[PDB]
Amino acid sequence: KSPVFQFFDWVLRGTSQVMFVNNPLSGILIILGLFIQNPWWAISGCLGTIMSTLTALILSQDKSAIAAGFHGYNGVLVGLLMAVFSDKGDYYWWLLLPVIIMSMSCPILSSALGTIFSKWDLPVFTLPFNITVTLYLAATGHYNLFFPTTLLQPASAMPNITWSEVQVPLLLRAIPVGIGQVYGCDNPWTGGIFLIALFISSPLICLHAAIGSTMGMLAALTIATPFDSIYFGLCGFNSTLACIAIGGMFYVITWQTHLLAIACALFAAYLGAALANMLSVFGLPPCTWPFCLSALTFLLLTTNNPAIYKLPLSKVTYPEANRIYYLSQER
Amino acid sequence: KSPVFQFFDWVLRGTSQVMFVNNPLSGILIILGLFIQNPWWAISGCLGTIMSTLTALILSQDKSAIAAGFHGYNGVLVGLLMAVFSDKGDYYWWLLLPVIIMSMSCPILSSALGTIFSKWDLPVFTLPFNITVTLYLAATGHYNLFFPTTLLQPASAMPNITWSEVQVPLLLRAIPVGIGQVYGCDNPWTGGIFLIALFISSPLICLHAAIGSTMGMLAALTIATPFDSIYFGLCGFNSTLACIAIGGMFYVITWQTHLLAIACALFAAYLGAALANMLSVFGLPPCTWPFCLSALTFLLLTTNNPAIYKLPLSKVTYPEANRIYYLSQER
Amino acid sequence: KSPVFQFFDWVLRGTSQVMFVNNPLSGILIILGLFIQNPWWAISGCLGTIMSTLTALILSQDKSAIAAGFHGYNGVLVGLLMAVFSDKGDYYWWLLLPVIIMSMSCPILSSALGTIFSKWDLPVFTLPFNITVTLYLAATGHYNLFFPTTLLQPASAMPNITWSEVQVPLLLRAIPVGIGQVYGCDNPWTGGIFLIALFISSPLICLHAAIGSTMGMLAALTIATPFDSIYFGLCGFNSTLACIAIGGMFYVITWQTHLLAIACALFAAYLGAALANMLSVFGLPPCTWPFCLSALTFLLLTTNNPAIYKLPLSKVTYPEANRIYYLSQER
């Protein structure tokens, strides 16, 4: 077909790869959810994805990786988190100019880390996004004249946690909001749209997403996390990403790997709290760093039993197809 | 014999591996020293070791490594440093619940880092402990409602150092206290018990431990470190660990390697001061990070002369046996 | 000739390797520029270079690398930045004692990182300097009794930027000052001497240095950097180093690689602002870390087109000779 249609297909698959989903319809649903949440944030994310894919094409990256969407799933997060942590409000058009520039750095990093990560057959997990956004938010800061950012500061007083005022409806609603917080969206409806987008592709990914989000919520209750943060979904996006990554895609789905994924979700939630407290000193948020560290430390794990099997990266599509491939190769 | 006795043997060897010693009697002496220092801290450390070894067995790790104690020497430090930096006092029983959870992460990290470190034949040096404890102490912080930690803050004023008030008896006693501070214990008697525990296995390890501790003390006097910190042994545990690691075990013991070990002790003490000042910003202590960085940067050193020889990890037991093996292989 | 003359030749080539130049006359010009700027800083830098080369010889490093100057280009920066960030003024003779000690750590790190970086054929880019100086400045701090450092603190208020008061003469003069700031020198005359020193060896290196400095200046205007910082040259030394590294030496010089070098300069300037803001929290400056990170992430970049070619490290001299070698090997 026309090259423009193929490029938009690449953009859609890139914006879907965030929850490790390669499906253009899932991309359309995710874009619709972003419009539901905040049109400005969605515009920023779409611009980030588009410029990231242009940078990937310019730098003569692999055509298969671009077609899959491997080079667009960092631009969308870059744009969305540029828009989320902007202190100038909505439709601050000049914010698009950083978004164009920083999204150019997503492919480069994605290649560079790849050269590092090829030696241990490790895939990159949105690390280009974390590095680029940390770079931007540190360079600008809350006291920038042009692109001020929302002020994040370390807690200097003991939080007041009235356990009699906990609301279990909101605590349960933290699950879809935890799913939607992967992109930075806090609207429960866009969380539901995201859950539908994952389910239309593969039910195992949706199940592991829900399990990871609820595990992050529970792990955040364990260390007396303020209730507003949990209700806002801040404690479940690293956990849901880790659960999706370790559950059935990069490990062949098995009950052993399922328990490993739950453990990875717990590790990612605790590391999320830790990185939030540490990075608040610089004024930066822990944007998907915890998921990266936990998933990478759980993919490098070497275990003797044959149930825990790590797939080669060349043959990773989605948990059902992964299990089918493992069963075919074994027989 | 009965599996329980073998498991307790594994726990003892694990709690001895901290100073790179593989001897159950040394483990018994170290546990006795911990009881001498603080029974609560010792209970926490023993629980950490036990749950770390259970996690290692569950994750089907190598049986030889578990039997040596390679998977228990991070749990003991994790438990001990959970107990040391607890603001709730002694016998705060709920602190055991983090200790169980965090000690599960010691084997995983120990495997993961191993997969990273196998490419350069580097052994892991309590990095799982540092990562896990940094995670915990950052997640909780001093203002946590459930598990508050002791407050560490950067120095904001010039220390007052009356050099006429220096006490050379305490300055000398900083050596055994420096040895005992590896576990977090400040009692001089438990430092002496630790020195006995190292000596009963191999005198070279004890000699290098004393040299490293005194080198850390001297290096801390060089940059006007407050006298209370030196008397408390805080400046000599990274140095003693680095001296033990580089002295005669991972390098064949020779006067060249001895001077290299002294240099590594100096580097580790200065890096310890640096990491203390940096990490105090987040409120975290430099728990054995300096020893890790210094020993890793000194094992990667490539030198043309044949005197400085680095042993393959498969054949590292203790300095006397290491030198015997080197002399046998050379001839 | 006499060994002393060869040793001084090694020192000169080492002090020239900072801008990736291997020429003793360039070393003489750089030393002259340092005397023009500040005799105390130059004395500190020369002592650092000398002791670094002695440490390299003692540790039996490669004779070819020492003769090239590969082990002296970290000592000079170490000494110069010890002297620049000293709060005791000029000719504080005791500062030489750290300078001797810390410069011993430049070869060790240079070897250690090499063992890490040999797997991906990456050269080390003054990382030993960054690690050592960060170690020193964190260990001492602004409140040290013996070697206090200049106080660096994060910005806590919005800067006042009167754009009508911008001075384009000083803005243009930020280019030679940006070149001279690689060593920490702020004098425009020593910047001109440095430009002459680069040009006498290879015009491409000088051109890329000027382009990188002006690119860093422009990138610093983009995020509303205070005018005093830009006039002082603080925003152009990481950028000029990155432009020199990526322009024509480690990549065969081509218009594609030229655009890549400009992009690397932009990335390095933005990362320089980010690292300045982050490291100001600890009180440390971003001493050449941004150039390191940007150049390393741009050398690991893998690109399919044949124009972007990365040379093996064994055959990298300077851009003209590099292009000659590439053209000879291709034919």
Chains in contact with chain B (at least 3 beta-carbon pairs closer than 8 A): A, C
What six digits make up the tokens of B3? Answer: 């599996």
Given an 8 Å threshold on Cβ–Cβ distance, is C270 in contact with A112? Answer: no
User: Is it true that C3-140 and C167-330 share their CATH fold?
Assistant: yes
What six digits make up the tokens of B292? Answer: 């890790």
Of B222, B277, B300, the CB nearest to C112: B300
Q: Rounded to the nearest 5°, which phi and psi values hold at A310?
A: -100, 125
What distance in Å separates the CA atoms of residue A111 and residue B69, rounded to the nearest whole number? 40
Q: How far is CA C86 from CA C35, C99, C101, C187, C279, in A?
A: 18, 12, 16, 18, 17
Cβ of residue B177 closer than 8 Å to a chain C Cβ: no
Given an 8 Å threshold on Cβ–Cβ distance, is B274 in contact with C138? Answer: yes
Taking the CA of residue A280 and the nearest CA in chain C, the distance in Å comes to: 11
Chain B neighbors of C111, CB-CB under 8 A? 300-303
Calculate ∠ Cα C250-C253-C254, nearest 5°: 135
Of B157, B273, B281, the CB nearest to C139: B273
Q: Sort C21 into a burial class: Cβ within 10 Å, 0-12 / 13-18 / 19+.
A: buried
**Could you say which DSSP state residue A251 is in?**
B
Given an 8 Å threshold on Cβ–Cβ distance, is C115 in contact with B273? Answer: no
What distance in Å separates the CA atoms of residue A286 and residue A277, rounded to the nearest whole number? 9
C126: left (phi over 0), alpha (psi -120 to 50) or beta: left
**Contacts of C160 by beta carbon, 8 Å cutoff, 6+ apart:** none
Chains in contact with chain A (at least 3 beta-carbon pairs closer than 8 A): B, C
Question: This structure's resolution (angstroms)?
Answer: 3.0
Report domain A3-140's class.
Answer: mainly alpha
What six digits make up the tokens of A206? Answer: 């949706």
Given an 8 Å threshold on Cβ–Cβ distance, is A136 in contact with C263? Answer: no
Torsion of the alpha carbons at B186, B190, B191 and B197, rounded to the nearest 10 = -150
Q: Rounded to the nearest 5°, which phi and psi values hold at B251?
A: -125, 140
Total beta-carbon pairs less than 8 A apart between chain A and chain B: 78
Nearest to C112, CA basis, from A109, B318, B310: B310
Cβ of residue C273 closer than 8 Å to a chain A Cβ: yes
Place of tokens 């275990």: A303
Of A112, A135, A281, the CB nearest to C281: A281
Nearest to B278, CA basis, from C280, C101, C16: C280
Amino acid code (one letter) for C81: L
Nearest to A148, CA basis, from A283, A288, A287: A283
B72 and B15 Cβ atoms separated by less than 8 Å: yes
Chains in contact with chain C (at least 3 beta-carbon pairs closer than 8 A): A, B
- Rounded to the nearest 5 percent, the helix, strand and coil shares of chain C are 70, 0, 30
Q: Rounded to the nearest 5°, which phi and psi values hold at C85?
A: -100, 35
Cβ of residue C301 closer than 8 Å to a chain A Cβ: yes
Cβ of residue B150 closer than 8 Å to a chain C Cβ: no
Cβ of residue A271 closer than 8 Å to a chain B Cβ: yes
Cβ of residue C158 closer than 8 Å to a chain A Cβ: yes
Given an 8 Å threshold on Cβ–Cβ distance, is B147 in contact with A301? Answer: no
**Could you say which DSSP state residue C122 is in?**
P
Chain B neighbors of A297, CB-CB under 8 A? 108-109, 112
In chain A, the residue whose alpha carbon lies closest to the alpha carbon of B103 is A267
Given an 8 Å threshold on Cβ–Cβ distance, is A115 in contact with C281? Answer: no
What six digits make up the tokens of C262? Answer: 């400009």
Nearest to B249, CA basis, from B187, B204, B200, B294: B204
| CATH 1.10.3430.10 assigned to A167-330 | yes
Cβ of residue A115 closer than 8 Å to a chain C Cβ: yes
C184: left (phi over 0), alpha (psi -120 to 50) or beta: left
What distance in Å separates the CA atoms of residue C146 and residue C142, rounded to the nearest whole number? 10
Cβ of residue B264 closer than 8 Å to a chain C Cβ: no
Taking the CA of residue A265 and the nearest CA in chain B, the distance in Å comes to: 12
B283: left (phi over 0), alpha (psi -120 to 50) or beta: left
Given an 8 Å threshold on Cβ–Cβ distance, is C143 in contact with B156? Answer: yes
Q: Rounded to the nearest 5°, which phi and psi values hold at A57?
A: -65, -40
Cβ of residue A188 closer than 8 Å to a chain C Cβ: no
Given an 8 Å threshold on Cβ–Cβ distance, is B146 in contact with A223? Answer: yes
Return the residue in B163, B259, B278 with the most chain C beta carbons within 10 A, the one to mutate for interface testing. B278
β-sheet bridge partners, residue C251: C310
Cβ of residue C281 closer than 8 Å to a chain A Cβ: yes
Asked whether the CA dihedral C144, C145, C151, C156 is positive or negative, the reply is positive
Experimental method: cryo-EM
Nearest to A117, CA basis, from C300, C112, C311: C300
B233 and B181 Cβ atoms separated by less than 8 Å: yes
SS3 annotation, A173-232? HHHHHHHHCCCCCCCHHHHHHHHHHHHHHCHHHHHHHHHHHHHHHHHHHHCCCCHHHHHC
- Rounded to the nearest 5 percent, the helix, strand and coil shares of chain A are 70, 0, 30
What six digits make up the tokens of C126? Answer: 């003054």
Under DSSP, is residue B185 helix (H, G, I), strand (E, B) or coil?
A: coil
What distance in Å separates the CA atoms of residue B120 and residue B296, rounded to the nearest whole number? 10
Nearest to B182, CA basis, from B15, B10, B13, B9: B15
Under DSSP, is residue B305 helix (H, G, I), strand (E, B) or coil?
A: coil
In chain A, the residue whose alpha carbon lies closest to the alpha carbon of B132 is A271
Q: How far is CA C308 from CA A63, C123, C243, C247, C298, in A?
A: 18, 18, 15, 11, 11
Given an 8 Å threshold on Cβ–Cβ distance, is C59 in contact with B155? Answer: no
Of A60, A115, A136, the CB nearest to C300: A115
What distance in Å separates the CA atoms of residue B38 and residue B185, rounded to the nearest whole number? 8
What distance in Å separates the CA atoms of residue C77 and residue C136, rounded to the nearest whole number? 13
B5 and B189 Cβ atoms separated by less than 8 Å: no
Torsion of the alpha carbons at A9, A13, A15 and A17, rounded to the nearest 10 = -170
Cβ of residue B278 closer than 8 Å to a chain A Cβ: no
What distance in Å separates the CA atoms of residue B273 and residue B235, rounded to the nearest whole number? 8
A301: left (phi over 0), alpha (psi -120 to 50) or beta: beta
In chain C, the residue whose alpha carbon lies closest to the alpha carbon of A59 is C303
SS3 annotation, C30-94? HHHHHHHHCHHHHHHHHHHHHHHHHHHHHCCCCHHHHHHCCCCCCHHHHHHHHHHCCCCCCCCHH
Return the residue in B55, B86, B101 with the most chain A beta carbons within 10 A, the one to mutate for interface testing. B101
Given an 8 Å threshold on Cβ–Cβ distance, is A223 in contact with B114? Answer: no
What six digits make up the tokens of B74? Answer: 């991070």
What six digits make up the tokens of C259? Answer: 């655009």
Q: Sort B30 into a burial class: Cβ within 10 Å, 0-12 / 13-18 / 19+.
A: buried
β-sheet bridge partners, residue A273: none
In chain A, the residue whose alpha carbon lies closest to the alpha carbon of C304 is A60
Of A119, A266, A277, the CB nearest to B138: A277
Taking the CA of residue B15 and the nearest CA in chain C, the distance in Å comes to: 30
What distance in Å separates the CA atoms of residue B176 and residue C312, rounded to the nearest whole number? 51
What distance in Å separates the CA atoms of residue B325 and residue B311, rounded to the nearest whole number? 10
Q: How far is CA B207 from CA B187, B221, B241, B324, in A?
A: 20, 21, 12, 18
Cβ of residue C167 closer than 8 Å to a chain A Cβ: no
Q: List chain C domain ranges.
A: 3-140, 167-330
Q: Rounded to the nearest 5°, which phi and psi values hold at C21?
A: -115, 130
What distance in Å separates the CA atoms of residue A232 and residue A35, rounded to the nearest whole number? 19
Chain C neighbors of B159, CB-CB under 8 A? 143, 145
Cβ of residue C282 closer than 8 Å to a chain B Cβ: yes
Count CB-CB contacts under 10 A for residue A88. Answer: 13
β-sheet bridge partners, residue C310: C251
Nearest to A106, CA basis, from A74, A58, A61: A74
**Could you say which DSSP state residue B177 is in?**
H
β-sheet bridge partners, residue B251: B310
Q: What is the DSSP string of C153-198?
A: ----S-----GGG--HHHHHHHHHHHHHTTTT---HHHHHHHHHHH
Where chain A is discontinuous (C–N > 2.5 Å), the residues before each break are none
**Contacts of B169 by beta carbon, 8 Å cutoff, 6+ apart:** none
Cβ of residue C118 closer than 8 Å to a chain A Cβ: no
Chain B neighbors of C136, CB-CB under 8 A? 270, 274
Cβ of residue A324 closer than 8 Å to a chain B Cβ: no
